[PDB]
Ligand SMILES: *[C@@H]1O[C@H](CO)[C@@H](O[C@@H]2O[C@H](CO)[C@@H](O)[C@H](O)[C@H]2NC(C)=O)[C@H](O)[C@H]1NC(C)=O
């Protein structure tokens with residue numbers, strides 16, 4: 001969020017005064033950036049713990065355990081389990 | 093080049109224009125004399141700009157950096173450092189302006 005533009009819409013009359021509050025404009029960006037930087041660290045450590053990208057063999061005999069729901073859908077342009085797409089519907 | 097203030101004087105006048113001064117002389121009969129030697133100099137106009145000033149242990153400023161010089165120079169003014177670590181930094185925003 002750009003403090004200067006948010007507080008003072010595109011107008012120097014207000015922009016001048018904002019200079020008198022000092023870092024309040026900037027340090028917010030530092031706070032927000034502080035959030036948004038680590039927001040990818042979250043997704044970093046949660047999802048990528050894996051050194052290499054595995055992929056299942058072409059043929060599945062697991063002993064009768066049918067994973068074709070959870071495995072990536074080869075046909076969807078974005079390869080995603082049949083289940084995952086249910087989620088992407090339910091959330092907006 | 094670091095320039096110390098010589099004298100801070102009460103002038104109180106606006107100066108909008110000027111010219112330099114010269115030292116010439118007279119010569120005597122040869123095939124009056126003027127324009128001793130050659131003369132050339134450099135002139136440039138000032139302008140408000142934000143510089144980051146790096147003093148030395150003895151206060152001798154070496155590195156100065158303008159913030160508005162290029163989109164690269166404006167980020168170094170955000171980190172205040174002359175060393176810029178490998179990565180992405182967010183320089184001041186830009187706006188499209190009305191025609
Ligand atoms: C795993 O399950 C999927 C669906 O849950 C099976 O795919 C179905 O196979 C039948 C044939 O028996 C077809 O009539 C259906 O149209 C298929 N559905 C889908 C969505 O493709 C699959 O055969 C099962 N495989 C194993 C090894 O259990």
Ligand SMILES: *[C@@H]1O[C@H](CO)[C@@H](O[C@@H]2O[C@H](CO)[C@@H](O)[C@H](O)[C@H]2NC(C)=O)[C@H](O)[C@H]1NC(C)=O
Pocket residue numbers: 106107108
């Ligand atoms: C600086 O000196 C200039 C004179 O050169 C003054 O500026 C003039 O201001 C009038 C308006 O009052 C304009 O019509 C002129 O065109 C200006 N001069 C030029 C050369 O453009 C000015 O008054 C002086 N500074 C201050 C602070 O008064």
